[PDB]
Design a protein around this ligand. Structure first.
Ligand SMILES: NC(=O)c1c[n+]([C@@H]2O[C@H](COP(=O)([O-])OP(=O)([O-])OC[C@H]3O[C@@H](n4cnc5c(N)[nH+]cnc54)[C@H](O)[C@@H]3O)[C@@H](O)[C@H]2O)ccc1-n1cccn1
Ligand SMILES: NC(=O)c1c[n+]([C@@H]2O[C@H](COP(=O)([O-])OP(=O)([O-])OC[C@H]3O[C@@H](n4cnc5c(N)[nH+]cnc54)[C@H](O)[C@@H]3O)[C@@H](O)[C@H]2O)ccc1-n1cccn1
Ligand SMILES: [Zn+2]
Ligand SMILES: [Zn+2]
Ligand SMILES: [Zn+2]
Ligand SMILES: [Zn+2]
Lengths: 374, 374
């Protein structure tokens, strides 16, 4: 009976960088034309949400963050055709408008309506649906899932299987799809190849999953936190290396281990130095390196372009290269059919009210994904 | 007869950086096992030979440069099976040993036996076949074509059609193949696409030829020398732009002209700034940029990795990505079958004795390719 009415609910508001989230009452406006209001069920903590806190990823504050989630449609605005009240949905932090040059391209997925390249922290219409203490609060990536209710544009939501377990499939909204697609869609890992994966968090584990699914013969995990190695091996890594253990730079180590460079390398951390190291460790004539980590705002890397002239390919991608609204329902259907596993990514579960504890777990190195339940 | 004997002949020796070539008598040793001695017939002047003079491209001096050439086998060493005396041949500045990981890979062409990565300026066996005034002279890229006779390793020569016109097909030894392959093999330009080509010298014109052959709908030539535009249009450019004409950076101009970025861009100059500009002007989600120009020794570029994270692909290649010994004979057969033209690249034909005049034409902006005839 909330349709057409403002909803008062709890959200996690970030008022300032480098401070805890504030769990407090917000007002959530009803959906306008082509908007959908969603009752959240579960949301994951992705490192990119932490990047908002640390100022690594700049977006306007104050803000409701969160972008990896699943929920149930509470109401729809005028003209919505793709979801209905009561449908299970995943918000799409990369929209799929279906009309722009990228959406029409066979490969492209970074729809021109995204709010990632130059964040404004609004709905598509340039306004906000959120008020707190009487003040407007920004959106994040058109999703804002750290709230009991959010409002998203229709191009930023996908209907998923009615029988889906939302406390698992929320990871299809970011970390799993990003890493898995980086391997299977962006790099196009080949059977029998050697892969190196830098960073063994939720996204990097999902890259390993995808390299293993593509038939790689060797998958070398790289992390400075050796506590990450056991789970990386469980999901497919054949060996793991800690750069801190070596006197030589790890690109040299990896080149030696792979008898002249790897076929595919993945940067899944977000550091400029490891982006260049990961490029360098792929074979100089035919290697491919994929950047998935999010770099610190406005900072440039330095590299020798002879790394490319010999024949290397360097690319990056958002959301694993997947066209979001076409792919998310299919990934959920494949999960339901047991084509991949999400449980290896989930190390902790907490109620939404303990969001700050969830971020502490990420920052301490202890968690992969913590799932928050509303 | 000359077989088995030292040949005294004329060559252009580079004794020091930034000096004219010295045209004088050298001694050319007979070929050892698996080596081939070639009587040169024609050699082109490529900007990479000038980079040796300018110190842009470091290789041991003193040196006999030259790498884009065609000639006739004078004699073969023990064990040679792929050419015989009297055969027309093109020396291969990128070898094809057929045994290394790169040669065995379907895509790779930068054979591990190359002398480009870490130049030693010798034969494969670590010695030189050249002396001048009693001093040993270095080889260049396993070819050294600025000489009436040279000696190359068997993996660095290809037999070509006995009826081929050597004064034209010498360009298949570098400039034509490099540019054409950058388009058709490395970028894999698609029908209907928009391409931008930075640098309208012999290599860049060959990139335009490839883009046109691949069916590009728009091919935008970019050069600071407007005298290069007429020939670019003759070989397929649909429009040309001079960055000096605009108040805004050319990547902005090209993004606007292409309604949001080009499909394929090509850096065919060798400047760090234009490498980054070329990357930036390709469409951010699905654009591809290829580096063909040779960068100045030991210098790094600076770039924001968000250019890649959005979805761009950045790659480079040597020799157009062609496996050299397999491809050169087929390219010559294709030329003989009128599948592409070489005449548009040739602006000047001079006797070998005028090599310095040929370099002056290149440096002054007045030539595309000068062919030197022996
Ligand atoms: N491209 C996308 O769409 C995208 C990008 N991100 C970004 O991916 C990176 C990884 O995210 P994560 O897996 O959620 O993060 P962590 O759990 O923190 O794992 C990182 C991993 O790296 C190790 N590490 C740190 N420093 C080093 C060094 N020097 N060497 C080796 N390993 C190192 C840690 O120990 C840890 O285990 C992040 O940058 C993230 O921002 C994620 C998801 C999506 N995206 C885009 C927008 C929203 N989400
Ligand atoms: N990758 C290979 O295998 C390769 C590489 N090279 C390199 O390609 C570049 C172009 O060579 P070229 O066509 O022989 O050179 P030029 O005739 O001098 O044409 C350059 C073109 O650029 C224009 N220009 C200069 N500066 C600018 C700026 N700032 N903006 C725009 N245009 C600009 C000039 O006016 C001129 O028209 C070289 O770097 C070359 O080294 C060639 C061949 C092969 N290779 C590798 C090893 C041996 N050969
Ligand atoms: Zn779109
Ligand atoms: Zn994320
Ligand atoms: Zn080889
Ligand atoms: Zn050349």
């Amino acid at each position: 009976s909330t349709a057409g009415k403002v909803i008062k609910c709890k959200a996690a508001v970030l008022w300032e960088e480098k401070k805890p989230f504030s769990i407090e009452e917000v007002e959530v406006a009803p959906p306008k034309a082509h908007e959908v209001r969603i009752k959240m069920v579960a949301t994951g903590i992705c490192r990119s949400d932490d990047h908002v806190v640390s100022g690594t990823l700049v977006t306007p504050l104050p803000v409701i963050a969160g972008h990896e989630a699943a929920g149930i449609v509470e109401s729809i605005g005028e003209g919505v055709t793709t979801v209905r009240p009561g449908d299970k949905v995943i918000p799409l932090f990369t929209p799929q408008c279906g009309k722009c040059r990228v959406c029409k391209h066979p490969e492209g997925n970074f729809c021109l309506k995204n709010d990632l390249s130059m964040p404004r922290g609004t709905m598509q219409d340039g306004t906000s649906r959120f008020t707190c203490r009487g003040k407007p609060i920004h959106h994040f990536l058109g999703t804002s899932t750290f709230s009991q209710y959010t409002v998203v544009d229709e191009i930023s939501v996908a209907k998923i299987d009615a029988a889906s377990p939302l406390e698992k499939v929320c990871l299809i909204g970011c970390g799993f799809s990003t890493g898995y697609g980086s391997a299977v869609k962006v790099a196009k890992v080949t059977q029998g190849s050697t892969c190196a994966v830098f960073g063994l968090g939720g996204v990097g584990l999902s890259v390993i999953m995808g390299c293993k699914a593509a038939g790689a013969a060797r998958i070398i995990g790289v992390d400075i936190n050796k506590d990450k190695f056991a789970k990386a091996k469980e999901v497919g890594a054949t060996e793991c290396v800690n750069p801190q253990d070596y006197k030589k730079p790890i690109q040299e180590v990896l080149t030696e281990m792979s008898n002249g460079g790897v076929d595919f390398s993945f940067e899944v951390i977000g550091r400029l130095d490891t982006m260049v190291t990961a490029l360098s460790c792929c074979q100089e004539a035919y290697g491919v390196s994929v950047i998935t980590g999010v770099p610190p705002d406005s900072q440039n890397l330095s590299m020798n372009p002879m790394l490319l002239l010999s024949g290397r390919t360097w690319k990056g991608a958002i959301f694993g290269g997947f066209k979001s609204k076409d792919s998310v329902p299919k990934l959920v259907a494949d999960f339901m059919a047991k084509k991949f596993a999400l449980d290896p990514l989930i190390t902790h579960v907490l109620p939404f009210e303990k969001i700050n504890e969830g971020f502490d777990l990420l920052r301490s190195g202890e968690s992969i994904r913590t799932i928050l339940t509303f």
